[PDB]
Nucleic acid binder design. Sequence first.
DNA 1: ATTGTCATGGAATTTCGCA
DNA 2: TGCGAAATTCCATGACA
DNA 3: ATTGTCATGGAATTTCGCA
DNA 4: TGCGAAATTCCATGACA
Lengths: 182, 182, 367, 367
Amino acid sequence: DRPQKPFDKFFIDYIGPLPPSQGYLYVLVVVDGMTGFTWLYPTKAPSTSATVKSLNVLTSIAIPKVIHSDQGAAFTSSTFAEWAKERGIHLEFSTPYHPQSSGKVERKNSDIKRLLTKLLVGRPTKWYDLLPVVQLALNNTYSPVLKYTPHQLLFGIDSNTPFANQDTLDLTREEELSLLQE
Amino acid sequence: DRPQKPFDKFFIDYIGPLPPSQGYLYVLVVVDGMTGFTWLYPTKAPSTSATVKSLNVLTSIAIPKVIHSDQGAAFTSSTFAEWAKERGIHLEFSTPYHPQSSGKVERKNSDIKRLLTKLLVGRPTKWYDLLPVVQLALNNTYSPVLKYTPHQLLFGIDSNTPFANQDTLDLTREEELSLLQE
Amino acid sequence: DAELDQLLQGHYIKGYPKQYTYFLEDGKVKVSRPEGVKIIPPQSDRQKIVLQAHNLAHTGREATLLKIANLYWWPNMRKDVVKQLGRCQQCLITNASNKASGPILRPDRPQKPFDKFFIDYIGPLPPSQGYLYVLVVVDGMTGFTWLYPTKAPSTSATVKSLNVLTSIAIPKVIHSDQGAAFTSSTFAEWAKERGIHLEFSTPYHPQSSGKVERKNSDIKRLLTKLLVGRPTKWYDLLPVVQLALNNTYSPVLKYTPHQLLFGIDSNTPFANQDTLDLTREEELSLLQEIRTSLYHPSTPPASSRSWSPVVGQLVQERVARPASLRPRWHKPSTVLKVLNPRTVVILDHLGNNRTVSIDNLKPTSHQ
Amino acid sequence: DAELDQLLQGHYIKGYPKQYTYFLEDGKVKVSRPEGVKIIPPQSDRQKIVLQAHNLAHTGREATLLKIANLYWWPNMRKDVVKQLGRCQQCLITNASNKASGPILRPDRPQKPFDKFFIDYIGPLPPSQGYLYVLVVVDGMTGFTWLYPTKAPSTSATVKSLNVLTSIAIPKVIHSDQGAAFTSSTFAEWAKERGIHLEFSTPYHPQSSGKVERKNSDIKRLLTKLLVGRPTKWYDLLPVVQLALNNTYSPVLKYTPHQLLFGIDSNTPFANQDTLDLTREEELSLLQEIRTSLYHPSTPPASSRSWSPVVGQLVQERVARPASLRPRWHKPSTVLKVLNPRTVVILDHLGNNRTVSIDNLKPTSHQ
DNA sequence: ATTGTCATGGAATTTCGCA
DNA sequence: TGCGAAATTCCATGACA
DNA sequence: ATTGTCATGGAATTTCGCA
DNA sequence: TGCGAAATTCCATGACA
Ligand SMILES: Nc1c(C(=O)NCc2ccc(F)cc2F)c(=O)n(O)c2ncc(CCS(=O)(=O)c3ccccc3)cc12
Ligand SMILES: Nc1c(C(=O)NCc2ccc(F)cc2F)c(=O)n(O)c2ncc(CCS(=O)(=O)c3ccccc3)cc12
Ligand SMILES: [Mg+2]
Ligand SMILES: [Mg+2]
Ligand SMILES: [Mg+2]
Ligand SMILES: [Mg+2]
Ligand SMILES: [Mg+2]
Ligand SMILES: [Mg+2]
Ligand SMILES: [Zn+2]
Ligand SMILES: [Zn+2]
């Protein structure tokens, strides 16, 4: 069998609804399966339109062979099926109520949820401007298994933003107070 | 003594007043002494201003060593004396009531008077537009003495407008009828 | 299928080299070449494959081939690629040429004064006494120049000025570019009345009026210097510039334009006195010898990758004032006649006969 | 008088050759040279004579001399002529140079992706969805390009676009010209917050941004082809052009910008499959070898009459947007430091220190 | 049915002044 | 029949929208 | 304190297929 | 160890306002 490579399989999913941030409510998460590299796109809804708009930006940089997702409405629509067929993208779906991807991707989506939650508290309407630094943090995070960051596996070089001071990712006691109040 | 050359001596004089032709009443006549080449400039008056204006056009093409004239007011003014001194032009005057120049120039000024009179009759207000063809006729007229036209002596070549059909220059009997009527 | 069927079982087809093993896999004919395993498509599919590869970014020969070679191999691929590049209309009319024009002609200096005038307009300039333009008239033989200020580059201002000029002498020929003032029927009428032949440059090529264009440079350069530290009141300086340049030596000629026209300096500063003891006829005889013996340049060497036009060749005229994101070249046209190595007649994109400079032509690529 | 008095009676003065007879006539010292009888003016009159001859048409060396030689002769005339040409301010700032710039540098290709971005704006273009401009961002090592449509070439539109871009990675250096969008303090603030060094071209020299300028040509050329026979609706085509050019082979490199950035093609047409059996680490090892071994051009030969700057030399900066009939050059300034053979620091005409390209400099003539 | 041109100042080459 | 310096000629460069 | 670049297609050069 | 043709490399040309 052939070794796993970047652009073989993008894993997509929606996070939301979130509090409004400059008119945006959701985040389309795209994770490359091999490298673990993450792209994040803010959208106003979990619709096919918003997915096609966000993925058109991504697919003007690089096109995946396969897109994997759960059976969410936006991904199972025939409009998204025609969009994928035009670009030669095979669509792949997990069984309903059994979302399965891969250990590296599961742990990556876990990091994204917790990293967002830690920065949502205190400034819950300002996450649109923080999406760039969130991606840089995720993509320059060390991988225990592969022993390389997503940035290193995708580009084959060290980064100019190494996040050496690893964030705790858990919430402090004071951040639980303002989180439980809201 | 040195042989006579073009630009050694311009002979200037005014002809007029003539009937109005596009606001102009006089003609400043400039004849080069050596070649017999003629320039004609229409003016609104026999003034120093009109002389200086017309001769500034000529002296941007070629500057004479000497300008000769009768003791007319425009030529004896101190403004015209200063104009000539700025350009290094020596002014030369004939004695009052004894206008003398040279046989070639006298015969040239005779031709100009008679050639104008012959074309004035019939169309006395249209001599402004005819000044170009009058100059070409005068400057491509054969010289009995030197056996070359003014054009040939000035430029050293044949002309593209040879006036082979020599004009009679005298007035016909019908042209005397319309001339004596006016 | 038919050609590729004999290939699989082992028979020889011309173009396909024998030393490689041609096999079938996943319903497709393949071959194990040193670069890797490539698919051999049938003859009927190849034009579509080349077109698909080319149209990705409308790439030229090698960039298109490198795409096709990632998946496919067949005999003489670049021949099929070049075939499609010559049929792609978008590439022919958008791409640049990579062949320079042939070396410039240096036409003979007119033999006599007033054989050929070169006229052109300078402007618009800063307003001076209400005047914005300058009519420049350069005698081809002598370089002797006349300057006239005008309010517009119009036929009426041109006729006004040339009537004053032609008081001194009529020229045989007047050369000009295809500007509105010179191409009007009113100007052609004015020229025919006086026996003057109107000669016109090829369109969009000021090199052809280069005699007067080069004089425009000296006129502007001297005006600039005289106006340093002053407001640009140039109307009064035109008589001064005209006289100054007409009496300026050309180092290569050793003569001023005034001297070439008259054979003797007038009463200007630093006037030459070498012919003071000669008669005028002796002076005019020396002038005729000077006029014939002037330096004249020759055609320079061609650049290493130049082209010269041939009758029947496909060529493309440059678009004059091309809009944004629009092609810089017209559709291919054919060379009817070669007037000289630098000038040709073509069967225009509209259908007309058009005389053009090869500087505004490229040879259509891929034949 | 004193020097010329001894000359008349027959004594020898240095500079004046003995074999000619120097006599007096009309109160002036003269000499019978082969060209003719010329006046020898005294030392005190000569500077005025050269100035009078020069100022007729502000002529250079030989044209000025030919005027003076009609009347006068004295020892080493051209030395006095060249002396005045170097003191004529109008000629120094108006005349053109006749020395070419030295040969261009070909700076090293950045070693890694995201070491140096080159950014620039295209526009204005025909309105498309209300957008008039395109921000072009070119990675120096790979050539991989990002395109962003904007309504103006502004700092706010630049920051918006680069925040989206830098989501993928932060660059070490961003190179740009001195356009208003990039020179603002708001942009410098944005770059310092992210650890990005702002590098700027020398003014009025787009060659220095040549990496992105050349990419602008390909962007416009492909847009032109795709819009043939259509209205210029280019907003929707920018994603297509971006993807197409990023996956286009450079014939000299044998690689696409995508391949130089990622080391493996994505799911695009005609994708390369040569590294299908390698692991990603084996693939990234081959990529690092490919990045270091790319072709790089060298400095071309200098033209036969080029100049290179020297510390302390008098040079003149080109006027940026010169008005009509105004000089094309600034007053002479001095070369403080030579940063490289093509770039220098000068003591500006205002008094400031200014870093400029030698393409916008001429060496002041006549020392 | 039309076509590049030529001032400029360092450098290269020739001529001058003297022997 | 030869040297050093001055004078002359050569010609690449650039700008005429 | 900074620096030209590179797609393009004929031509020149090298490699291929076969002997 | 050498030929004819195909494949590859060379590189002048021009345009990015
Ligand atoms: N653009 C014109 C130039 C010009 O660009 N000169 C720069 C130049 C560049 C190189 C060179 F070697 C010499 C040179 F002077 C020009 O000089 N003139 O006189 C023009 N006269 C009229 C028009 C109007 C449109 S046209 O269709 O009548 C037309 C277009 C082009 C040329 C002539 C006539 C334009 C121009
Ligand atoms: N004129 C600009 C060009 C241009 O002329 N390109 C043509 C070009 C020519 C030759 C070459 F080799 C490549 C090349 F692209 C340009 O490309 N850019 O991006 C500009 N960007 C901004 C401004 C605004 C005034 S500025 O003072 O900020 C300034 C002036 C000049 C340059 C840069 C910045 C002008 C330009
Ligand atoms: Mg979901
Ligand atoms: Mg009188
Ligand atoms: Mg014109
Ligand atoms: Mg012009
Ligand atoms: Mg710019
Ligand atoms: Mg630019
Ligand atoms: Zn094409
Ligand atoms: Zn000057």
